[PDB]
Structure formats: C-alpha cells, structure tokens
MMTF fields as JSON, N, C-alpha, C and O atoms, coordinates in Angstrom:
{
  "mmtfVersion": "1.0.0",
  "mmtfProducer": "UNKNOWN",
  "numBonds": 578,
  "numAtoms": 580,
  "numGroups": 145,
  "numChains": 1,
  "numModels": 1,
  "chainsPerModel": [1],
  "groupsPerChain": [145],
  "chainIdList": ["A"],
  "bondAtomList": [4, 2, 8, 6, 12, 10, 16, 14, 20, 18, 24, 22, 28, 26, 32, 30, 36, 34, 40, 38, 44, 42, 48, 46, 52, 50, 56, 54, 60, 58, 64, 62, 68, 66, 72, 70, 76, 74, 80, 78, 84, 82, 88, 86, 92, 90, 96, 94, 100, 98, 104, 102, 108, 106, 112, 110, 116, 114, 120, 118, 124, 122, 128, 126, 132, 130, 140, 138, 144, 142, 148, 146, 152, 150, 156, 154, 160, 158, 164, 162, 168, 166, 172, 170, 176, 174, 180, 178, 184, 182, 188, 186, 192, 190, 196, 194, 200, 198, 204, 202, 208, 206, 212, 210, 216, 214, 220, 218, 224, 222, 228, 226, 232, 230, 236, 234, 240, 238, 244, 242, 248, 246, 252, 250, 256, 254, 260, 258, 264, 262, 268, 266, 272, 270, 276, 274, 280, 278, 284, 282, 288, 286, 292, 290, 296, 294, 300, 298, 304, 302, 308, 306, 312, 310, 316, 314, 320, 318, 324, 322, 328, 326, 332, 330, 336, 334, 340, 338, 344, 342, 348, 346, 352, 350, 356, 354, 360, 358, 364, 362, 368, 366, 372, 370, 376, 374, 380, 378, 384, 382, 388, 386, 392, 390, 396, 394, 400, 398, 404, 402, 408, 406, 412, 410, 416, 414, 420, 418, 424, 422, 428, 426, 432, 430, 436, 434, 440, 438, 444, 442, 448, 446, 452, 450, 456, 454, 460, 458, 464, 462, 468, 466, 472, 470, 476, 474, 480, 478, 484, 482, 488, 486, 492, 490, 496, 494, 500, 498, 504, 502, 508, 506, 512, 510, 516, 514, 520, 518, 524, 522, 528, 526, 532, 530, 536, 534, 540, 538, 544, 542, 548, 546, 552, 550, 556, 554, 560, 558, 564, 562, 568, 566, 572, 570, 576, 574],
  "bondOrderList": [1, 1, 1, 1, 1, 1, 1, 1, 1, 1, 1, 1, 1, 1, 1, 1, 1, 1, 1, 1, 1, 1, 1, 1, 1, 1, 1, 1, 1, 1, 1, 1, 1, 1, 1, 1, 1, 1, 1, 1, 1, 1, 1, 1, 1, 1, 1, 1, 1, 1, 1, 1, 1, 1, 1, 1, 1, 1, 1, 1, 1, 1, 1, 1, 1, 1, 1, 1, 1, 1, 1, 1, 1, 1, 1, 1, 1, 1, 1, 1, 1, 1, 1, 1, 1, 1, 1, 1, 1, 1, 1, 1, 1, 1, 1, 1, 1, 1, 1, 1, 1, 1, 1, 1, 1, 1, 1, 1, 1, 1, 1, 1, 1, 1, 1, 1, 1, 1, 1, 1, 1, 1, 1, 1, 1, 1, 1, 1, 1, 1, 1, 1, 1, 1, 1, 1, 1, 1, 1, 1, 1, 1, 1],
  "groupList": [{"groupName": "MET", "atomNameList": ["N", "CA", "C", "O"], "elementList": ["N", "C", "C", "O"], "formalChargeList": [0, 0, 0, 0], "bondAtomList": [1, 0, 2, 1, 3, 2], "bondOrderList": [1, 1, 2], "singleLetterCode": "M", "chemCompType": "L-PEPTIDE LINKING"}, {"groupName": "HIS", "atomNameList": ["N", "CA", "C", "O"], "elementList": ["N", "C", "C", "O"], "formalChargeList": [0, 0, 0, 0], "bondAtomList": [1, 0, 2, 1, 3, 2], "bondOrderList": [1, 1, 2], "singleLetterCode": "H", "chemCompType": "L-PEPTIDE LINKING"}, {"groupName": "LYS", "atomNameList": ["N", "CA", "C", "O"], "elementList": ["N", "C", "C", "O"], "formalChargeList": [0, 0, 0, 0], "bondAtomList": [1, 0, 2, 1, 3, 2], "bondOrderList": [1, 1, 2], "singleLetterCode": "K", "chemCompType": "L-PEPTIDE LINKING"}, {"groupName": "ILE", "atomNameList": ["N", "CA", "C", "O"], "elementList": ["N", "C", "C", "O"], "formalChargeList": [0, 0, 0, 0], "bondAtomList": [1, 0, 2, 1, 3, 2], "bondOrderList": [1, 1, 2], "singleLetterCode": "I", "chemCompType": "L-PEPTIDE LINKING"}, {"groupName": "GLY", "atomNameList": ["N", "CA", "C", "O"], "elementList": ["N", "C", "C", "O"], "formalChargeList": [0, 0, 0, 0], "bondAtomList": [1, 0, 2, 1, 3, 2], "bondOrderList": [1, 1, 2], "singleLetterCode": "G", "chemCompType": "PEPTIDE LINKING"}, {"groupName": "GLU", "atomNameList": ["N", "CA", "C", "O"], "elementList": ["N", "C", "C", "O"], "formalChargeList": [0, 0, 0, 0], "bondAtomList": [1, 0, 2, 1, 3, 2], "bondOrderList": [1, 1, 2], "singleLetterCode": "E", "chemCompType": "L-PEPTIDE LINKING"}, {"groupName": "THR", "atomNameList": ["N", "CA", "C", "O"], "elementList": ["N", "C", "C", "O"], "formalChargeList": [0, 0, 0, 0], "bondAtomList": [1, 0, 2, 1, 3, 2], "bondOrderList": [1, 1, 2], "singleLetterCode": "T", "chemCompType": "L-PEPTIDE LINKING"}, {"groupName": "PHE", "atomNameList": ["N", "CA", "C", "O"], "elementList": ["N", "C", "C", "O"], "formalChargeList": [0, 0, 0, 0], "bondAtomList": [1, 0, 2, 1, 3, 2], "bondOrderList": [1, 1, 2], "singleLetterCode": "F", "chemCompType": "L-PEPTIDE LINKING"}, {"groupName": "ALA", "atomNameList": ["N", "CA", "C", "O"], "elementList": ["N", "C", "C", "O"], "formalChargeList": [0, 0, 0, 0], "bondAtomList": [1, 0, 2, 1, 3, 2], "bondOrderList": [1, 1, 2], "singleLetterCode": "A", "chemCompType": "L-PEPTIDE LINKING"}, {"groupName": "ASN", "atomNameList": ["N", "CA", "C", "O"], "elementList": ["N", "C", "C", "O"], "formalChargeList": [0, 0, 0, 0], "bondAtomList": [1, 0, 2, 1, 3, 2], "bondOrderList": [1, 1, 2], "singleLetterCode": "N", "chemCompType": "L-PEPTIDE LINKING"}, {"groupName": "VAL", "atomNameList": ["N", "CA", "C", "O"], "elementList": ["N", "C", "C", "O"], "formalChargeList": [0, 0, 0, 0], "bondAtomList": [1, 0, 2, 1, 3, 2], "bondOrderList": [1, 1, 2], "singleLetterCode": "V", "chemCompType": "L-PEPTIDE LINKING"}, {"groupName": "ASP", "atomNameList": ["N", "CA", "C", "O"], "elementList": ["N", "C", "C", "O"], "formalChargeList": [0, 0, 0, 0], "bondAtomList": [1, 0, 2, 1, 3, 2], "bondOrderList": [1, 1, 2], "singleLetterCode": "D", "chemCompType": "L-PEPTIDE LINKING"}, {"groupName": "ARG", "atomNameList": ["N", "CA", "C", "O"], "elementList": ["N", "C", "C", "O"], "formalChargeList": [0, 0, 0, 0], "bondAtomList": [1, 0, 2, 1, 3, 2], "bondOrderList": [1, 1, 2], "singleLetterCode": "R", "chemCompType": "L-PEPTIDE LINKING"}, {"groupName": "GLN", "atomNameList": ["N", "CA", "C", "O"], "elementList": ["N", "C", "C", "O"], "formalChargeList": [0, 0, 0, 0], "bondAtomList": [1, 0, 2, 1, 3, 2], "bondOrderList": [1, 1, 2], "singleLetterCode": "Q", "chemCompType": "L-PEPTIDE LINKING"}, {"groupName": "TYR", "atomNameList": ["N", "CA", "C", "O"], "elementList": ["N", "C", "C", "O"], "formalChargeList": [0, 0, 0, 0], "bondAtomList": [1, 0, 2, 1, 3, 2], "bondOrderList": [1, 1, 2], "singleLetterCode": "Y", "chemCompType": "L-PEPTIDE LINKING"}, {"groupName": "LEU", "atomNameList": ["N", "CA", "C", "O"], "elementList": ["N", "C", "C", "O"], "formalChargeList": [0, 0, 0, 0], "bondAtomList": [1, 0, 2, 1, 3, 2], "bondOrderList": [1, 1, 2], "singleLetterCode": "L", "chemCompType": "L-PEPTIDE LINKING"}, {"groupName": "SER", "atomNameList": ["N", "CA", "C", "O"], "elementList": ["N", "C", "C", "O"], "formalChargeList": [0, 0, 0, 0], "bondAtomList": [1, 0, 2, 1, 3, 2], "bondOrderList": [1, 1, 2], "singleLetterCode": "S", "chemCompType": "L-PEPTIDE LINKING"}, {"groupName": "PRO", "atomNameList": ["N", "CA", "C", "O"], "elementList": ["N", "C", "C", "O"], "formalChargeList": [0, 0, 0, 0], "bondAtomList": [1, 0, 2, 1, 3, 2], "bondOrderList": [1, 1, 2], "singleLetterCode": "P", "chemCompType": "L-PEPTIDE LINKING"}],
  "groupTypeList": [0, 1, 2, 3, 4, 5, 6, 7, 2, 8, 4, 1, 6, 9, 7, 6, 10, 9, 2, 10, 11, 12, 10, 13, 2, 4, 5, 14, 0, 9, 10, 4, 4, 8, 6, 3, 2, 11, 11, 5, 5, 12, 15, 3, 3, 5, 10, 6, 0, 5, 9, 3, 4, 5, 11, 16, 3, 16, 14, 9, 7, 3, 4, 7, 11, 15, 12, 11, 2, 9, 11, 13, 16, 10, 12, 17, 10, 7, 16, 3, 5, 5, 2, 4, 12, 3, 15, 0, 4, 4, 6, 15, 10, 16, 4, 2, 2, 10, 6, 4, 10, 15, 16, 14, 10, 3, 17, 2, 4, 5, 13, 2, 1, 14, 6, 15, 10, 14, 9, 17, 7, 15, 8, 11, 6, 9, 16, 16, 9, 6, 5, 5, 12, 10, 2, 11, 11, 3, 11, 14, 15, 10, 2, 15, 11],
  "groupIdList": [1, 2, 3, 4, 5, 6, 7, 8, 9, 10, 11, 12, 13, 14, 15, 16, 17, 18, 19, 20, 21, 22, 23, 24, 25, 26, 27, 28, 29, 30, 31, 32, 33, 34, 35, 36, 37, 38, 39, 40, 41, 42, 43, 44, 45, 46, 47, 48, 49, 50, 51, 52, 53, 54, 55, 56, 57, 58, 59, 60, 61, 62, 63, 64, 65, 66, 67, 68, 69, 70, 71, 72, 73, 74, 75, 76, 77, 78, 79, 80, 81, 82, 83, 84, 85, 86, 87, 88, 89, 90, 91, 92, 93, 94, 95, 96, 97, 98, 99, 100, 101, 102, 103, 104, 105, 106, 107, 108, 109, 110, 111, 112, 113, 114, 115, 116, 117, 118, 119, 120, 121, 122, 123, 124, 125, 126, 127, 128, 129, 130, 131, 132, 133, 134, 135, 136, 137, 138, 139, 140, 141, 142, 143, 144, 145],
  "secStructList": [7, 5, 7, 6, 6, 7, 3, 3, 3, 3, 6, 6, 3, 3, 3, 3, 3, 3, 3, 3, 3, 3, 3, 7, 1, 1, 7, 5, 3, 3, 1, 1, 7, 7, 7, 5, 7, 7, 7, 1, 3, 3, 3, 3, 3, 3, 3, 3, 3, 3, 3, 7, 1, 1, 1, 7, 3, 3, 3, 3, 4, 4, 4, 3, 3, 3, 3, 7, 6, 6, 7, 7, 3, 3, 7, 7, 3, 3, 7, 1, 6, 6, 6, 6, 6, 5, 7, 7, 3, 3, 3, 3, 7, 6, 6, 7, 3, 3, 3, 3, 3, 3, 3, 3, 3, 3, 7, 6, 6, 7, 4, 4, 4, 7, 3, 3, 3, 3, 7, 2, 2, 2, 2, 5, 7, 7, 1, 6, 6, 1, 4, 4, 4, 4, 4, 4, 7, 7, 7, 3, 3, 3, 3, 7, 7],
  "xCoordList": [-16.114, -14.933, -14.656, -15.448, -13.544, -13.236, -12.499, -11.714, -12.809, -12.368, -11.185, -10.911, -10.505, -9.261, -10.083, -11.113, -9.5, -9.965, -10.927, -11.119, -11.471, -12.344, -11.711, -10.741, -12.165, -11.585, -12.645, -13.861, -12.025, -12.918, -12.276, -11.074, -13.06, -12.484, -11.997, -12.74, -10.741, -10.166, -9.312, -8.258, -9.859, -9.261, -9.282, -10.346, -8.096, -8.035, -7.472, -6.89, -7.655, -7.255, -8.374, -9.315, -8.218, -9.017, -8.011, -6.965, -8.343, -7.405, -7.807, -8.954, -6.912, -7.268, -6.143, -4.978, -6.512, -5.575, -5.935, -7.063, -4.875, -5.045, -5.115, -6.188, -3.864, -3.746, -2.8, -2.045, -2.845, -1.943, -1.322, -1.964, -0.025, 0.68, 1.535, 1.794, 1.924, 2.708, 3.944, 3.859, 5.008, 6.243, 6.822, 6.469, 7.699, 8.374, 9.9, 10.41, 10.595, 12.006, 12.409, 11.838, 13.468, 13.817, 14.328, 14.011, 15.21, 15.717, 14.855, 14.547, 14.488, 13.645, 14.381, 15.366, 13.837, 14.492, 13.481, 12.427, 13.815, 12.934, 13.08, 14.193, 11.912, 11.872, 12.097, 11.252, 13.192, 13.568, 13.768, 13.127, 14.729, 15.088, 15.662, 15.176, 16.73, 17.386, 18.919, 19.621, 21.534, 20.749, 19.895, 20.388, 18.548, 17.636, 16.783, 16.495, 16.45, 15.699, 14.311, 13.663, 13.801, 12.365, 12.098, 12.879, 10.965, 10.542, 9.355, 9.497, 8.148, 7.186, 6.682, 6.959, 5.929, 5.391, 5.347, 5.007, 5.708, 5.729, 4.544, 4.315, 3.838, 2.771, 3.279, 4.126, 2.711, 3.178, 1.951, 1.325, 1.6, 0.335, 0.522, 1.351, -0.164, -0.029, -1.169, -2.32, -0.904, -1.982, -1.822, -0.83, -2.858, -2.915, -3.429, -4.436, -2.772, -3.199, -3.537, -2.739, -4.691, -5.067, -5.402, -6.303, -4.672, -4.84, -6.006, -5.962, -7.025, -8.215, -8.504, -9.561, -7.41, -7.442, -6.679, -6.091, -6.652, -5.907, -4.459, -3.588, -4.211, -2.732, -2.002, -2.558, -0.678, 0.17, 0.23, 0.019, 0.514, 0.575, 1.996, 2.442, 2.656, 3.852, 3.553, 3.496, 3.354, 2.944, 4.124, 5.234, 3.919, 4.959, 4.608, 3.439, 5.527, 5.218, 4.731, 4.108, 5.043, 4.63, 3.056, 2.513, 2.367, 0.872, 0.233, -0.988, 1.049, 0.58, 0.914, 1.973, 0.038, 0.331, -0.625, -1.773, -0.011, -0.701, -0.941, -0.03, -2.194, -2.498, -2.936, -3.329, -2.828, -3.273, -4.767, -5.516, -5.143, -6.59, -6.499, -7.497, -5.261, -5.184, -4.756, -4.175, -5.036, -4.839, -3.32, -3.162, -2.32, -1.028, -0.234, -0.346, 0.644, 1.344, 2.367, 2.967, 2.562, 3.532, 4.56, 4.225, 5.75, 6.943, 6.845, 6.6, 7.07, 7.095, 8.358, 9.377, 8.341, 9.55, 9.669, 8.695, 10.759, 10.97, 11.83, 12.804, 11.576, 12.372, 13.019, 12.387, 14.242, 14.893, 14.224, 14.535, 13.273, 12.405, 11.564, 11.74, 10.616, 9.802, 10.476, 9.968, 11.667, 12.553, 11.749, 11.233, 11.679, 11.042, 9.47, 8.778, 8.999, 7.631, 7.518, 6.479, 8.505, 8.507, 8.007, 8.623, 6.879, 6.261, 7.112, 7.229, 7.708, 8.526, 7.983, 7.443, 8.15, 7.727, 7.857, 8.464, 7.228, 7.34, 6.232, 5.391, 6.142, 5.123, 4.087, 4.387, 2.8, 1.655, 0.747, -0.137, 1.055, 0.35, -1.136, -1.516, -1.964, -3.412, -3.794, -3.258, -4.803, -5.287, -4.427, -4.874, -3.231, -2.418, -2.429, -2.737, -2.121, -2.06, -0.717, 0.164, -0.465, 0.766, 0.407, -0.486, 1.212, 0.871, 2.229, 3.305, 2.088, 3.393, 3.02, 1.844, 4.022, 3.855, 4.33, 5.307, 3.59, 3.95, 4.231, 3.578, 5.196, 5.536, 5.605, 6.041, 5.186, 5.248, 5.418, 4.927, 6.107, 6.306, 5.294, 5.166, 4.597, 3.52, 3.548, 4.19, 2.802, 2.645, 2.147, 1.303, 2.591, 2.048, 0.459, -0.256, 0.041, -1.351, -2.306, -3.432, -1.742, -2.482, -3.025, -3.517, -2.92, -3.428, -4.787, -4.853, -5.88, -7.065, -7.276, -8.284, -6.344, -6.366, -5.737, -5.525, -5.456, -4.836, -5.566, -6.17, -5.46, -6.133, -5.042, -4.098, -5.151, -4.233, -4.849, -6.07, -4.063, -4.677, -4.03, -2.827, -4.93, -4.468, -4.906, -6.097, -3.961, -4.428, -3.902, -2.696, -4.818, -4.339, -3.694, -2.934, -4.006, -3.285, -1.827, -0.883, -1.684, -0.329, 0.427, 1.591, -0.267, 0.306, 0.834, 1.652, 0.304, 0.663, 1.537, 1.056, 2.687, 3.7, 4.077, 5.155, 3.115, 3.271, 3.16, 2.151, 4.246, 4.229, 3.646, 3.419, 3.392, 2.783, 1.268, 0.832, 0.506, -0.891, -1.318, -2.371, -0.518, -0.871, -2.132, -3.019, -2.193, -3.421, -4.614, -5.726, -4.452, -5.573, -6.093, -6.934, -5.649, -6.102, -6.128, -6.089, -6.193, -6.287, -7.478, -7.479, -8.518, -9.778, -9.586, -10.322, -8.61, -8.34, -7.749, -7.706, -7.313, -6.764, -7.733, -8.361, -7.868, -8.783, -8.201, -7.727, -8.247, -7.753, -8.822, -10.016, -8.375, -9.217, -8.753, -7.589, -9.601, -9.207, -9.614, -10.77, -8.644, -8.998, -8.726, -7.566, -9.689, -9.546, -8.845, -9.207, -7.865, -7.265, -7.803, -7.197, -8.932, -9.484, -10.538, -11.093],
  "yCoordList": [4.85, 3.957, 3.17, 2.336, 3.492, 2.855, 4.034, 4.803, 4.09, 5.024, 4.539, 3.34, 5.449, 5.173, 4.453, 4.947, 3.227, 2.662, 1.454, 0.554, 1.503, 0.437, -0.814, -0.691, -2.047, -3.335, -3.825, -3.715, -4.386, -4.863, -6.111, -6.341, -6.869, -8.045, -7.645, -7.004, -7.991, -7.682, -8.955, -9.208, -9.735, -10.928, -11.94, -12.227, -12.534, -13.57, -12.933, -13.639, -11.665, -10.999, -9.982, -9.65, -9.554, -8.596, -7.515, -7.714, -6.274, -5.27, -3.906, -3.487, -3.214, -2.028, -1.016, -1.363, 0.212, 1.353, 1.796, 2.203, 1.694, 2.03, 3.501, 4.087, 4.126, 5.591, 6.205, 5.517, 7.436, 8.25, 9.336, 10.33, 9.117, 10.072, 10.916, 10.466, 12.067, 12.909, 13.439, 13.805, 13.454, 13.969, 15.074, 15.178, 15.905, 17.008, 16.79, 16.007, 17.421, 17.209, 15.693, 14.838, 15.453, 14.119, 13.848, 14.547, 12.711, 12.303, 11.116, 10.246, 11.115, 10.048, 9.5, 10.065, 8.373, 7.739, 7.084, 6.642, 7.012, 6.411, 4.981, 4.456, 4.268, 2.796, 2.146, 1.374, 2.437, 1.793, 2.674, 3.703, 2.164, 2.809, 4.263, 5.128, 4.493, 5.82, 5.698, 6.708, 11.718, 12.036, 13.218, 14.338, 12.983, 14.082, 14.195, 13.238, 15.506, 15.895, 16.139, 15.637, 17.007, 17.368, 18.005, 18.8, 17.587, 18.18, 19.043, 20.263, 18.515, 19.369, 18.55, 18.944, 17.388, 16.615, 15.203, 14.953, 14.214, 12.802, 12.011, 12.061, 11.321, 10.49, 9.152, 8.52, 8.73, 7.389, 6.571, 6.586, 5.831, 5.075, 3.69, 2.932, 3.335, 1.976, 1.127, 1.563, 0.009, -0.905, -2.299, -2.619, -3.089, -4.402, -5.363, -5.068, -6.551, -7.525, -8.795, -9.229, -9.373, -10.599, -11.676, -11.532, -12.696, -13.862, -14.735, -15.406, -14.751, -15.559, -16.656, -17.286, -16.859, -17.983, -19.129, -19.067, -20.25, -21.478, -21.287, -21.594, -20.74, -20.643, -19.555, -18.517, -19.804, -18.829, -17.654, -17.811, -16.494, -15.289, -14.646, -14.479, -14.307, -13.624, -12.171, -11.783, -11.318, -9.912, -9.153, -9.495, -8.017, -7.255, -5.8, -5.498, -4.885, -3.465, -2.97, -1.914, -3.796, -3.364, -3.464, -3.008, -3.99, -4.1, -2.788, -2.65, -1.803, -0.536, 0.636, 0.655, 1.678, 2.91, 4.051, 3.842, 5.258, 6.395, 7.254, 7.446, 7.771, 8.546, 10.032, 10.265, 10.918, 12.332, 12.529, 11.581, 13.781, 14.146, 13.917, 13.59, 14.101, 13.923, 12.485, 12.194, 11.556, 10.183, 9.763, 8.933, 10.376, 10.074, 9.548, 10.064, 8.431, 7.733, 8.625, 9.511, 8.39, 9.064, 8.038, 7.062, 8.224, 7.332, 6.972, 7.796, 5.634, 5.172, 5.636, 5.809, 5.842, 6.282, 5.512, 4.887, 5.532, 5.011, 5.773, 6.333, 5.877, 6.558, 5.582, 4.619, 5.878, 5.086, 5.041, 4.223, 5.974, 6.012, 4.819, 4.046, 4.566, 3.418, 2.174, 1.348, 1.966, 0.845, -0.435, -0.431, -1.429, -2.666, -2.671, -3.683, -1.457, -1.243, -1.142, -1.469, -0.724, -0.592, -1.829, -2.89, -1.715, -2.816, -3.155, -2.327, -4.382, -4.692, -5.966, -5.879, -7.113, -8.308, -9.429, -9.244, -10.59, -11.676, -12.668, -12.503, -13.752, -14.699, -14.358, -13.834, -14.742, -14.481, -15.734, -15.802, -16.711, -18.013, -17.701, -16.676, -18.717, -18.622, -18.324, -18.866, -17.383, -16.958, -15.875, -15.294, -15.61, -14.67, -13.188, -12.948, -12.263, -10.858, -10.276, -10.826, -9.143, -8.585, -7.021, -6.598, -6.23, -4.785, -4.053, -4.428, -2.992, -2.315, -0.94, -0.578, -0.148, 1.19, 1.436, 0.84, 2.386, 2.891, 4.319, 4.955, 4.93, 6.323, 7.092, 6.557, 8.386, 9.199, 10.588, 11.01, 11.398, 12.813, 13.6, 13.366, 14.543, 15.372, 16.766, 17.045, 17.696, 19.007, 19.17, 18.373, 20.189, 20.453, 20.501, 21.073, 19.771, 19.656, 19.422, 19.91, 18.673, 18.274, 16.844, 16.281, 16.292, 14.858, 14.356, 13.265, 15.185, 14.878, 14.588, 13.976, 15.011, 14.775, 13.462, 13.234, 12.621, 11.362, 9.974, 9.759, 9.08, 7.849, 6.788, 6.836, 5.833, 4.694, 3.663, 3.508, 2.916, 1.916, 0.609, 0.52, -0.474, -1.755, -2.8, -2.894, -3.591, -4.643, -5.916, -6.163, -6.759, -7.933, -9.011, -9.868, -8.942, -9.885, -9.389, -10.178, -8.028, -7.476, -7.675, -8.072, -7.391, -7.557, -8.96, -9.084, -9.972, -11.334, -11.958, -12.312, -12.071, -12.563, -14.063, -14.469, -14.902, -16.326, -16.751, -16.505, -17.41, -17.854, -19.219, -19.585, -20.002, -21.273, -21.406, -22.441, -20.386, -20.348, -18.995, -18.446, -18.505, -17.24, -17.255, -16.415, -18.313, -18.403, -18.71, -18.342, -19.364, -19.654, -18.443, -18.607, -17.289, -16.145, -14.791, -13.679, -14.991, -13.844, -12.926, -11.717, -13.639, -12.889, -11.796, -10.809, -11.971, -10.936, -9.649, -8.592, -9.766, -8.53, -7.393, -7.216, -6.638, -5.485, -4.458, -4.844, -3.161, -2.061, -1.667, -1.619, -1.394, -0.974, 0.322, 0.444, 1.38, 2.657, 3.142, 3.022, 3.675, 4.19, 5.611, 6.008, 6.403, 7.916, 8.258, 7.684, 9.158, 9.531, 10.866, 11.908, 10.846, 12.068, 11.703, 12.566],
  "zCoordList": [-2.363, -2.524, -1.151, -0.712, -0.567, 0.751, 1.541, 0.986, 2.793, 3.681, 4.546, 4.603, 5.199, 6.04, 7.284, 7.743, 7.767, 8.963, 8.66, 9.478, 7.513, 7.03, 6.514, 5.767, 6.839, 6.435, 5.379, 5.539, 4.267, 3.177, 2.498, 2.63, 1.809, 1.089, -0.241, -0.983, -0.62, -1.819, -2.149, -1.566, -3.135, -3.545, -2.476, -1.926, -2.128, -1.172, 0.174, 0.997, 0.35, 1.489, 2.007, 1.285, 3.197, 3.84, 4.016, 4.633, 3.433, 3.397, 4.125, 3.969, 4.904, 5.514, 5.599, 5.79, 5.456, 5.607, 7.035, 7.316, 7.978, 9.321, 9.571, 9.712, 9.626, 9.732, 8.757, 8.07, 8.705, 7.916, 8.777, 9.117, 9.13, 9.935, 8.895, 7.779, 9.291, 8.427, 9.213, 10.385, 8.549, 9.266, 8.411, 7.236, 8.952, 8.227, 8.253, 7.451, 9.1, 9.114, 9.096, 9.774, 8.236, 8.067, 6.693, 5.731, 6.61, 5.26, 4.877, 5.691, 3.642, 3.091, 1.823, 1.346, 1.322, 0.208, -0.692, -0.235, -2.067, -2.995, -2.963, -2.98, -2.913, -2.81, -4.185, -4.637, -4.839, -6.067, -7.316, -7.53, -8.124, -9.393, -9.411, -10.139, -8.566, -8.573, -8.392, -8.374, -0.83, 0.244, 0.021, -0.105, -0.036, -0.197, 1.183, 1.903, 1.401, 2.769, 2.57, 1.652, 3.538, 3.522, 2.081, 1.558, 1.526, 0.164, 0.559, 0.482, 0.993, 1.555, 2.789, 3.922, 2.582, 3.63, 3.14, 1.984, 4.054, 3.872, 4.482, 5.691, 3.671, 4.193, 4.65, 4.019, 5.811, 6.372, 6.563, 7.623, 5.494, 5.492, 6.103, 5.599, 7.109, 7.793, 7.185, 7.217, 6.671, 6.136, 6.774, 7.429, 6.536, 7.06, 6.039, 5.396, 5.836, 4.853, 5.664, 6.495, 5.424, 6.078, 5.04, 4.214, 5.121, 4.233, 4.603, 5.633, 3.82, 4.035, 3.132, 3.108, 2.33, 1.39, 1.874, 2.953, 1.085, 1.496, 1.222, 2.036, -0.015, -0.367, 0.272, 0.63, 0.426, 1.085, 0.13, -1.073, 0.656, -0.147, 0.081, 1.217, -1.014, -1.037, -1.307, -2.474, -0.269, -0.51, -0.861, -0.454, -1.684, -2.189, -2.331, -2.574, -2.198, -2.315, -3.658, -3.768, -4.725, -6.035, -6.132, -7.138, -5.218, -5.314, -4.93, -5.002, -4.514, -3.989, -4.803, -5.43, -4.841, -5.614, -5.073, -4.683, -5.102, -4.655, -5.92, -6.725, -6.081, -7.239, -6.758, -5.615, -7.688, -7.489, -7.809, -8.044, -7.804, -8.211, -9.764, -10.407, -10.346, -11.753, -12.003, -13.048, -11.043, -11.081, -11.601, -12.496, -10.992, -11.395, -10.23, -9.117, -10.487, -9.495, -8.751, -9.359, -7.442, -6.633, -6.23, -5.559, -6.607, -6.226, -4.691, -3.809, -4.498, -3.042, -2.351, -3.018, -1.065, -0.346, 0.966, 1.383, 1.595, 2.942, 3.794, 3.291, 5.136, 6.007, 7.105, 7.54, 7.499, 8.405, 9.749, 10.615, 9.887, 11.272, 11.35, 12.292, 10.416, 10.549, 10.277, 9.519, 10.883, 10.756, 11.285, 12.402, 10.498, 10.93, 10.565, 10.678, 10.128, 9.694, 8.18, 7.606, 7.582, 6.083, 5.374, 5.478, 4.638, 3.924, 2.665, 1.761, 2.613, 1.527, 0.786, -0.317, 1.428, 0.871, 1.996, 3.051, 1.653, 2.513, 2.409, 1.526, 3.28, 3.075, 4.215, 5.288, 3.811, 4.704, 4.516, 3.661, 5.397, 5.382, 5.663, 6.229, 5.198, 5.417, 6.81, 7.777, 6.892, 8.22, 8.929, 9.918, 8.444, 9.091, 8.6, 7.433, 9.405, 9.057, 9.069, 9.73, 8.355, 8.377, 8.258, 7.525, 9.065, 9.114, 8.781, 9.249, 7.942, 7.512, 7.045, 7.053, 6.627, 6.164, 4.782, 4.329, 4.045, 2.734, 2.89, 3.717, 2.136, 2.277, 1.046, 0.026, 1.052, -0.138, 0.199, 1.245, -0.63, -0.435, -1.346, -2.547, -0.667, -1.365, -0.82, 0.193, -1.541, -1.063, 0.235, 0.645, 1.021, 2.377, 2.414, 1.592, 3.559, 3.731, 2.467, 2.368, 1.599, 0.364, 0.452, -0.526, 1.631, 1.783, 1.195, 0.629, 1.344, 0.974, -0.499, -0.853, -1.399, -2.779, -3.272, -4.463, -2.272, -2.498, -2.223, -1.172, -3.226, -3.125, -3.065, -3.854, -2.147, -2.137, -2.952, -2.923, -3.707, -4.6, -4.227, -3.98, -4.194, -3.713, -4.766, -5.063, -5.337, -6.289, -5.705, -5.728, -5.162, -4.528, -5.48, -5.027, -6.743, -7.675, -7.837, -7.858, -7.951, -8.101, -6.685, -6.645, -5.615, -4.287, -3.812, -2.9, -4.497, -4.265, -5.354, -6.43, -5.086, -6.129, -6.058, -6.492, -5.475, -5.504, -6.969, -7.629, -7.47, -8.88, -9.146, -10.299, -8.059, -8.21, -8.539, -9.041, -8.26, -8.469, -9.127, -8.802, -10.009, -10.696, -11.56, -11.408, -12.546, -13.307, -12.469, -12.847, -11.351, -10.481, -9.718, -8.835, -10.007, -9.289, -10.159, -9.633, -11.453, -12.348, -12.061, -12.294, -11.518, -11.244, -10.223, -10.206, -9.384, -8.255, -8.903, -8.273, -10.131, -10.726, -10.838, -11.882, -9.821, -9.727, -8.707, -7.638, -9.055, -8.226, -7.14, -7.437, -5.906, -4.795, -4.382, -4.0, -4.419, -4.009, -2.571, -2.166, -1.849, -0.497, -0.467, -0.572, -0.335, -0.362, 0.948, 1.975, 0.975, 2.254, 2.743, 2.492, 3.439, 4.184, 5.096, 5.776]
}
C-alpha cells in the first residue's frame, strides 16, 4: 500500500503521512457529532497535502478516516495541545502545500493495526468543479507501522 514518510500522487494532490506521535495524559475531544480524559492512547498523525492541479482545493477533514484490522472507522479527535496544527478545512491554491494533524484514540501500543485512508475527491470540497473530478474518487491506504 503506502508507508509512513512516503509521498505519492493521489488525485490532484501529492499526499504524505509525516509522523505518528502518541500521547497519554491529556483531555481530548471528538471532532464532531457529540470532558473526557485519557482512554488508552491517542495517535497524532501529521499529514501534508500538495495541490498539483490548476484549480484551487478546499481541503476538509471529512476526506480522512482511520480503519482497524477489522476495517472499521475510528472517530476523529482533537487535543488543545496541537493548537494551530489541527487539520480542519481551508483553501490550498495551485502549487501550495498544507500540513496538519489528525487524531484518534486507540488501545495502548496497538498502532500497527491501523491504516489511514485518504480520498482526494472527498478531501476536496470545491463545489465549482465537482463533476470535473469524479475520477479522483478513490481510497488511498497508508499502513501505520
């Protein structure tokens, strides 16, 4: 599939999972549809998106997902710590890069059983050229080990 550290072409972007840091003590929060503390361990995946197409890209957190060995989604989370780094949404004009973090709570030292999923069509929320990019609708897996 794809490994941590490797850059690859995905749709109109070059995408990469930089590092995976893990924290313990700390309060975390669900990124949508809901004070909780440490559960077991929180992944802090840093990723980078590079727009290599002509059209501007409106990147969004919904384009991301973490799956189990049983291929099940893990709710996204965010900590007050990575303030300013939390990947949410924004515009990425042609030729530009954006780096941010995704976060999830999982069983202690269970990291190797997880795959980050990236769908460039889903990640780009530009409504002006949607039909013009349906071909990008494909999942890209990055195993975390």
